[PDB]
Amino acid sequence: MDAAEVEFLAEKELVTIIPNFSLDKIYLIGGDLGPFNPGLPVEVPLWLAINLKQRQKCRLLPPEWMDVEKLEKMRDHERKEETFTPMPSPYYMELTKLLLNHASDNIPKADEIRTLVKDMWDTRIAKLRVSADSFVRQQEAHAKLDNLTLMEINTSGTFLTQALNHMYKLRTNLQP
Amino acid sequence: DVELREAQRDYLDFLDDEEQGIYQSKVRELISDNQYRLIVNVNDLRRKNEKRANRLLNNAFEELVAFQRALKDFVASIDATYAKQYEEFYVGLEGSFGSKHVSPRTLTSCFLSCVVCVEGIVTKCSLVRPKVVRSVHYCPATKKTIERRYSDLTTLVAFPSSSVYPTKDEENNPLETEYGLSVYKDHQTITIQEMPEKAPAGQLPRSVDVILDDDLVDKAKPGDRVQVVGTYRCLPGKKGGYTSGTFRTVLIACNVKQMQPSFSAEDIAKIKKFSKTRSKDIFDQLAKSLAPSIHGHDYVKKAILCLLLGGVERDLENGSHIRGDINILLIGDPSVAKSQLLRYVLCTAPRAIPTTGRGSSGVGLTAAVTTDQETGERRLEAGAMVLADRGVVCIDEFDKMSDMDRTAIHEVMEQGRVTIAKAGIHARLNARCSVLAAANPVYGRYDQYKTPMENIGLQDSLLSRFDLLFIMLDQMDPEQDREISDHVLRMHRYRAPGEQDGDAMPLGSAVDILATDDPNTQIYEKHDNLLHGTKKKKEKMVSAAFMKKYIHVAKIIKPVLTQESATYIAEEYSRLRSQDSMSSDTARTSPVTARTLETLIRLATAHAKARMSKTVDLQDAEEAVELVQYAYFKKVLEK
């Protein structure tokens, strides 16, 4: 898996948009997308939201968790704890990147939101680094990584798994 | 506090090992041999207690203090009287220190308060001076004795104690020092410099200052290549209540190692068998094996082997002297491998000093005066030939040396002594060395139609001081050209097994030795197609390591001349000297003199050494006569 594919998975999350067009209910294979009425909010997958924004057909609304006070509390909690804390979204980094890159005009205080998400990302990456070092140094056979998102795992997963494969083979040399 | 007690407990546990017994036995030996320093291998400590080893290497002074306290307690446990004998017991370290292996360039501030192992060359030494440790004083009026302890920034527990001795008691009654009851330790300072081959491009080598105390004094002399294990400290100072904040740094040694072969029984048996195998072929094989990368100059290589082996110097009951050192001169056309043979001897001989005619002076060759670092005392520093005492001096571009500088070489070349009469200093220095010199003729390229004396352009006395003189000519011969070209191109195609294709030699190198003992013998070198060719390999090559061991063992033998050899040598000397115009074309390169007879004796003795024989026999004399016959005459071409 590469980062583009994790972003592809993240693009299936639902967000809210206000369209400037009228459309009847669409019966997509994935699921119905309610009628579109100018000025009224509607929930759609992130990929369709980004596409409609790029075509000047909708205005995006920030998710509930994309709030400065909530994000500051979450960053402080993440810094205080030892393990990974539960995240507002399983694709918070990708959602933040896409929404703030394409609709900053629609999201007030986007710079603060980006900085807080960056802080959380840095803390969690450091925790994952500590976890990997502990796994190798203490010669573990298994680990628990709860509340860790797919993008975080994918950032260094291949390296860690290859190292663990080599280490296991070195641990099982003497068995005939 | 508690950490110090725990460290002392751990170290005492480490040295009480009868329940494998290596350090219990080492301490017993220390007692038996009258020593007060125990050398500890950090690998054993790391094996038995890793945390204690890491702390020792990273917090050196406190850990060493605890270690030495524990050692004193253990020694007292084995024998209390011996412990009372010595003020303190010291600990030296050896083994692998990981990243603490450094050079004077890589020894930086990040290694402060750490144990480090430095490798380098000793450039400067100082005089040994006593340093007061404990002072004892007696009061004649009150009949009581008082003791004082001293320490400085250089002691393990740094504290700037006062140097002034007590002179009176708290009561006014006066005090007198008991010098024979006080304690003093020897103290010396040296400088260790980066190895020039390791320096980066365009950079002069860096240096570090080292402090040797107690037994470690005089373990190293200038010119040595040493490995010093010690602790790295800064010496902060103040003046008028002001500090610059820039501090000198010193290395406080705990162990000094040299970088004298060690012989095992198997190696001794191999050497004895090699000597026994052949009677006449040993010398020829050894000479053939000397500098493999040079296509043959066979007689010159035999002469260089004789030079390395040497003769036997005679001391007479009256006190007269006859030298045993063999001197060789090579005069030649450009590009005939003279400098390469000199460089090979420089790389292989145990003590060899390089010198260039244009880059040397009489002072630099013999000795120099300067002010002592302390007290400004007129002191002497050894020159090249004194540093080469019982060694070799290789002088390249001999014809470029100034005549006045050349004249200073006569006394060393003949008598082996240097007389210093300057700056209120009158000394006789021992410079008993063999001279290997290379030169070009007066016209650059030897003129065969002129005589040897006119080409060489040197005075007969200097030529007489050389045991052998070799005229090496480049004669364009298609077959010789083919052979030399094949050899040279094979040499240039060679690639060492470790290296990969396309690799370039770097300018400079990082520290490669990662232990005090090298973690890594066979008589004959393994065959390599490029190094030796596709020939059937009928001639075998003796390996470099075996050659180094064999020559060391042979140099100690002193063959005794026999009556038959003496008769043959006398007859041959008479024939050599009487023969005038022995060949009408032939001319003498050097005059035949009684020095020629001494040279015959020297060469025969060296040949007998090569065989490891206790007597000089007729074969050795015949070989010496053959060498002299080849060297002393040259045909002159007529146009």
């Binding site: 583009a4 972003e7 592809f8 790029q54 | -």
Partner: protein, 195 residues
Amino acid sequence: FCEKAMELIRELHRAPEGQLPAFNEDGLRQVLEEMKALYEQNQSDVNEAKSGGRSDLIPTIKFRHCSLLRNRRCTVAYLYDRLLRIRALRWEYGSVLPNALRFHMAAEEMEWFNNYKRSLATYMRSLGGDEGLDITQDMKPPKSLYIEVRCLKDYGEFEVDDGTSVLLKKNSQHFLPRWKCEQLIRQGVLEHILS
């Protein structure tokens, strides 16, 4: 002994990016000739061992047999790695290879490539009701239905729909559906312009 096969292996090892060098015909023939020589010497030794009951020859027979096996292993590894690179060619460029690349391949390698191409076409045809699914396309996740493309070289007529085509000339730009341009982009004919 096995140094020629070692040269065969080293040639491929020196190019770890998958490029196909020219087939080493002379090296392969050398290896085969050496194998025949080894086999003949072993046959003579085996016959003598049977005839005269000389045990001392068995180590030599084993040594030669091991050398033969080593030569075989190196040959097969070389050929198989070449096959892997050729296989990658199909998925990286397409069904029709540039003549430059065809030049390096041996004739037998071209036959292998043609057979593999036919098998892949059959499998891709078998997936769906009509025409199946061409899984050589859609190599990256899709973002937009249409994209902007610039012609990096002259290519001539290019069919958009059966009715209509467009002329590809250098430094012209076209706004086209992505699924019609992916293949030419992967071949270095078009460049994807992001604005």
